[PDB]
Amino acid sequence: AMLEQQQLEESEKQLQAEMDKAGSSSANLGASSLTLKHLIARIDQKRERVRASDAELRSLMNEVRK
Amino acid sequence: LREQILLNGARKARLTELVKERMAYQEYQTILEDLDAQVNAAYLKRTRTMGPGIGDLARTLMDRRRRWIE
Amino acid sequence: EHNLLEYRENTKAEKKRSREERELLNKAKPFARMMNRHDFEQFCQGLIDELNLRQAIAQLQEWRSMRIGDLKSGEKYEQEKALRIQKSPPSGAALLVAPELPARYK
């Protein structure tokens, strides 16, 4: 498995450098959280106004995320 | 000079309290507008083709927009 | 608000100002959306005041190391130095180092 993944990673990089040049809060939300880090900070501080649940809100954020 | 630096720091200190809240509004708006374009652009096709029942995509986008706003 | 419809008046002052002041004002432009007219004027003027004061203090400290012992002779030396470097209205930093200080700095 270690060798197989290395071969795939090597193949991925090899294919890279070719197409690129041609084309020239606590929960683990993911990379999208950076696009709403400030919003995610403000929502919690005023968590009394909002009424959704954190699980739903992440689902709502996931659904609306492009 | 020592008298003016403190005043500037105080002024800049307050603005940082008003800037942070405005950044959050930007992120909430930049996703709301995207939904607005889809719900807006998902109805023009009905006019273009002149149709029939409302498509599911247009029925499940209004609530998504409404859930986000409310 | 802020009288952004006066293209002639707003530009001329920007031309009159110097290079360093121009950069600082251009850097603080966006925040005008949040403050009223007077607050923006106070905000910008303060930044200019601090920048000019630093220049004057740095200017004076240079004189004292040359053994210049009067504000009159300091200006004389600067004029001769300008001639020497050539041989080889007044700005804010020039009004603070005048023989008579402005009223608003007392």
Task: Determine the 3-state secondary structure of C74 from DSSP.
Answer: helix
Tokens encoding C61: 């400290």
DSSP per-residue string spanning C8-29: HHHHHHHHHS-HHHHHHHHHT-
DSSP per-residue string spanning C36-54: -HHHHHHHHHHHHHHHHHH
- The yes-or-no reply on B/C contact (3 CB pairs or more, < 8 Å) is yes
B5–C47 CB contact, under 8 Å? no
Chain A contact present for B1, CB below 8 A: no
Query: In 3-state terms, chain B is what percent helix, strand and coil (to 5)?
Result: 90, 0, 10
Cα torsion B31, B37, B39, B40 to 10°: value is 150
C46–B7 CB contact, under 8 Å? yes
Specify whether the backbone of B50 is left (phi greater than 0), alpha (psi in -120 to 50) or beta.
Answer: left
Residue C23 near residue C15, CB atoms below 8 Å? no
HSE on the CB side for C83, CA within 13 Å?
A: 6
Identify the residue whose tokens are 């991925």. Answer: A12
Minimum distance, in Å, between the CA of residue C82 and any CA atom of chain B: 28
B1–C53 CB contact, under 8 Å? yes
**Burial bucket for residue C4 (CB in 10 Å: 0-12, 13-18, 19+):** exposed
Write out chain B residues lying below 8 Å of C46, CB-based. Answer: 4, 7-8, 11
**Distance (Å, whole) CA A25 – CA A27:** 6
Resolution (A): 3.5
Tokens encoding B44: 């023009």
